[PDB]
Design an enzyme around this catalytic site. Structure first.
Site, PDB file in Angstrom:
ATOM      1  N   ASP A   1       0.850  -1.167   0.000  1.00  0.00           N
ATOM      2  CA  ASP A   1       0.000   0.000   0.000  1.00  0.00           C
ATOM      3  C   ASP A   1       0.904   1.241   0.000  1.00  0.00           C
ATOM      4  O   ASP A   1       2.044   1.176   0.478  1.00  0.00           O
ATOM      5  CB  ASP A   1      -0.855   0.043   1.338  1.00  0.00           C
ATOM      6  CG  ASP A   1      -1.754  -1.144   1.490  1.00  0.00           C
ATOM      7  OD1 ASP A   1      -1.288  -2.212   2.018  1.00  0.00           O
ATOM      8  OD2 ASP A   1      -2.906  -1.102   1.065  1.00  0.00           O
TER       9      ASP A   1
ATOM     10  N   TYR B   1       2.569   4.785   1.261  1.00  0.00           N
ATOM     11  CA  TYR B   1       2.807   5.343   2.572  1.00  0.00           C
ATOM     12  C   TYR B   1       1.551   6.095   3.033  1.00  0.00           C
ATOM     13  O   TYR B   1       0.963   6.863   2.285  1.00  0.00           O
ATOM     14  CB  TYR B   1       3.942   6.388   2.545  1.00  0.00           C
ATOM     15  CG  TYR B   1       5.300   5.852   2.274  1.00  0.00           C
ATOM     16  CD1 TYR B   1       5.901   4.994   3.150  1.00  0.00           C
ATOM     17  CD2 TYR B   1       6.042   6.234   1.128  1.00  0.00           C
ATOM     18  CE1 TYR B   1       7.163   4.517   2.919  1.00  0.00           C
ATOM     19  CE2 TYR B   1       7.309   5.791   0.894  1.00  0.00           C
ATOM     20  CZ  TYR B   1       7.888   4.906   1.799  1.00  0.00           C
ATOM     21  OH  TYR B   1       9.181   4.416   1.645  1.00  0.00           O
TER      22      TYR B   1
ATOM     23  N   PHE C   1       7.709   2.880  -2.404  1.00  0.00           N
ATOM     24  CA  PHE C   1       8.850   3.184  -1.565  1.00  0.00           C
ATOM     25  C   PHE C   1       9.432   4.569  -1.738  1.00  0.00           C
ATOM     26  O   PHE C   1      10.067   5.067  -0.822  1.00  0.00           O
ATOM     27  CB  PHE C   1       9.958   2.126  -1.692  1.00  0.00           C
ATOM     28  CG  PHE C   1       9.487   0.718  -1.321  1.00  0.00           C
ATOM     29  CD1 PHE C   1       9.310   0.387   0.007  1.00  0.00           C
ATOM     30  CD2 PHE C   1       9.197  -0.210  -2.316  1.00  0.00           C
ATOM     31  CE1 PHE C   1       8.919  -0.878   0.356  1.00  0.00           C
ATOM     32  CE2 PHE C   1       8.665  -1.468  -1.966  1.00  0.00           C
ATOM     33  CZ  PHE C   1       8.567  -1.745  -0.625  1.00  0.00           C
TER      34      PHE C   1
ATOM     35  N   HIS D   1      11.034  -8.406   4.588  1.00  0.00           N
ATOM     36  CA  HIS D   1      10.794  -7.021   4.235  1.00  0.00           C
ATOM     37  C   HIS D   1      11.834  -6.073   4.837  1.00  0.00           C
ATOM     38  O   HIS D   1      12.349  -6.333   5.914  1.00  0.00           O
ATOM     39  CB  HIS D   1       9.369  -6.705   4.676  1.00  0.00           C
ATOM     40  CG  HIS D   1       8.804  -5.432   4.153  1.00  0.00           C
ATOM     41  ND1 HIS D   1       9.076  -4.224   4.744  1.00  0.00           N
ATOM     42  CD2 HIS D   1       7.921  -5.203   3.177  1.00  0.00           C
ATOM     43  CE1 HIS D   1       8.428  -3.283   4.109  1.00  0.00           C
ATOM     44  NE2 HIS D   1       7.734  -3.862   3.139  1.00  0.00           N
TER      45      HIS D   1
HETATM   46  O1  LIG Z   1       4.932   2.488  -1.401  1.00  0.00           O
HETATM   47  C1  LIG Z   1       5.248   1.745  -0.414  1.00  0.00           C
HETATM   48  N1  LIG Z   1       6.083   2.218   0.458  1.00  0.00           N
HETATM   49  C2  LIG Z   1       6.423   1.427   1.451  1.00  0.00           C
HETATM   50  C3  LIG Z   1       5.901   0.159   1.637  1.00  0.00           C
HETATM   51  N2  LIG Z   1       6.332  -0.592   2.738  1.00  0.00           N
HETATM   52  O2  LIG Z   1       7.397  -0.131   3.528  1.00  0.00           O
HETATM   53  O3  LIG Z   1       5.716  -1.686   3.010  1.00  0.00           O
HETATM   54  C4  LIG Z   1       5.054  -0.301   0.638  1.00  0.00           C
HETATM   55  O4  LIG Z   1       4.535  -1.435   0.617  1.00  0.00           O
HETATM   56  N3  LIG Z   1       4.776   0.490  -0.401  1.00  0.00           N
END
Ligand SMILES: O=c1[nH]cc([N+](=O)[O-])c(=O)[nH]1
Ligand SMILES: [Cl-]
Ligand SMILES: [Cl-]
Length: 224
Positions: free
Chosen positions: A65, A67, A78, A188
């Site tokens: 998803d 942030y 990310f 992760h």
């Molecule tokens: O865009 C995102 N940023 C960070 C995460 N995450 O750290 O799970 C992610 O799943 N998606």
């Protein structure tokens, strides 16, 4: 507005099977704003991963998803805008591994646009979120959209390396089944898990090892 107006040509064709679903998500988002709820990322950024050429993609890095912190999500998994600081801790951990794996200095900022330009697809499974409410747009319709995207990508004749970080990402392995695809998997980069299998995993160099072994050019991972 039709898909060809929102995304790159190759993605518009790949995502045809879900064109109605994408229109429905635009309706959902409008209804959120009408109901007095916000969403992230900005509307203009929601489909941003699909603005970089479908045919040019060589690596898929799956997120879950966006942030949920205001001002962080930019439509590429990310990544953050260049003025965002400090980096989200998952991103900081990604960057620690980047330096240790590749030997490059710490990046100047959290903007991953250069990866996207070079054929790294920074795709979340769910493309929007309500601010301060993690994972709040699960089940709203994006999963079918992004499943279409990943299946289309996998169906190309071209090489693909999928980088699957965490348990939810690993469940996409079945859909990368084809001989042209190869998945690498680890825990992760979140602090919860990172020292229990992410740090030292060498995903960037290994992805390049795999691409070169499949006849493809490696990714230049270097960030400014
Ligand atoms: O865009 C995102 N940023 C960070 C995460 N995450 O750290 O799970 C992610 O799943 N998606
Ligand atoms: Cl809200
Ligand atoms: Cl590199």
């Amino acid at each position: 507005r039709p898909l060809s107006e929102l995304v790159e040509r190759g993605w518009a064709a790949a995502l045809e099977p879900v064109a109605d679903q994408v229109a429905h998500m635009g309706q959902f988002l409008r209804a959120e704003i009408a109901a007095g709820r916000r969403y992230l990322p900005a509307g203009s950024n929601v489909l941003r991963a699909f603005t970089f050429p479908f045919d040019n993609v060589r690596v898929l890095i799956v997120g879950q998803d966006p942030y949920p912190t205001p001002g962080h999500a930019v439509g590429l998994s990310f990544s953050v805008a260049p003025d965002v600081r400090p980096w989200p801790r998952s991103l900081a951990n990604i960057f620690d591994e980047y330096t240790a794996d590749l030997g490059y200095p710490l990046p100047s900022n959290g903007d991953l646009t250069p990866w996207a330009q070079r054929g790294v697809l920074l795709l979340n499974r769910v493309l929007t979120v309500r601010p301060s409410n993690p994972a709040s747009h699960r089940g709203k319709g994006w999963e079918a959209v992004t499943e279409c995207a990943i299946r289309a990508l996998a169906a190309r004749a071209a090489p693909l390396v999928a980088i699957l970080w965490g348990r939810d990402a690993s469940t996409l392995k079945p859909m990368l089944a084809a001989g042209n695809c190869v998945a690498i998997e680890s825990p992760h980069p979140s602090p919860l898990s990172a020292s229990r299998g992410f740090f030292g995993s060498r995903p960037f160099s290994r992805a390049n090892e795999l691409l070169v072994g499949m006849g493809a050019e490696p990714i230049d991972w270097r960030l400014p």
